[PDB]
2-amino-4-hydroxy-6-hydroxymethyldihydropteridine pyrophosphokinase
Amino acid sequence: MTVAYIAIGSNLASPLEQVNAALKALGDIPESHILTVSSFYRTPPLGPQDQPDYLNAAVALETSLAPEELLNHTQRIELQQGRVRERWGPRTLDLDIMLFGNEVINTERLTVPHYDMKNRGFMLWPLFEIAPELVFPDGEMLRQILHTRAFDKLNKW
Ligand SMILES: Nc1ncnc2c1ncn2[C@@H]1O[C@H](COP(=O)(O)CP(=O)(O)OP(=O)(O)O)[C@@H](O)[C@H]1O
Ligand SMILES: COc1ccc(C(=O)CSc2nc3c(=O)[nH]c(N)nc3[nH]2)cc1
Ligand SMILES: [Cl-]
Ligand SMILES: [Cl-]
Ligand SMILES: [Mg+2]
Ligand SMILES: [Mg+2]
């Protein structure tokens, strides 16, 4: 078993309802158990700014699934909650795999640690709440990133 950390985001169709339904669905993923859920945060949008504020959260999930098997299930949850294919536009549910233990994976389908996560306060702050001692695959400590980079603290939802 490995602990995966998943970021949740929603800014359409009642984000609180979306994130709750997504948590229940994550709890139904085979060979997996939720370990920890962060607080829910109201965050201003990165990317296009002409869209509603996001609800963001992070979850620690212990799993025996292969990384791409976990991805299949997170994408299925996104599809069932109405995610459909502008760039970086509003969405009902986004589930990103931030980390899958200390694995590094570089494929088109799956890139872990998530592309750009070290520059996203809406991912790092909820992650720090649930895993303050977290160390990245390259040896960087989550605490040092937040200590050294200018990331505004988030407001709770
Ligand atoms: N760590 C990861 N978590 C989730 N999806 C990933 C991923 N690495 C790669 N992907 C791929 O990313 C594809 C689509 O991602 P999207 O959710 O549409 C982009 P986004 O979240 O709006 O921007 P971002 O990827 O810059 O956060 C999926 O088909 C999936 O295969
Ligand atoms: C370089 O600048 C960036 C461009 C795009 C992004 C994205 O994450 C992809 S779309 C998106 N998702 C969310 C989100 O979940 N929460 C918040 N607050 N904003 C979001 N925007 C990040 C940084
Ligand atoms: Cl959507
Ligand atoms: Cl890393
Ligand atoms: Mg995303
Ligand atoms: Mg995504």
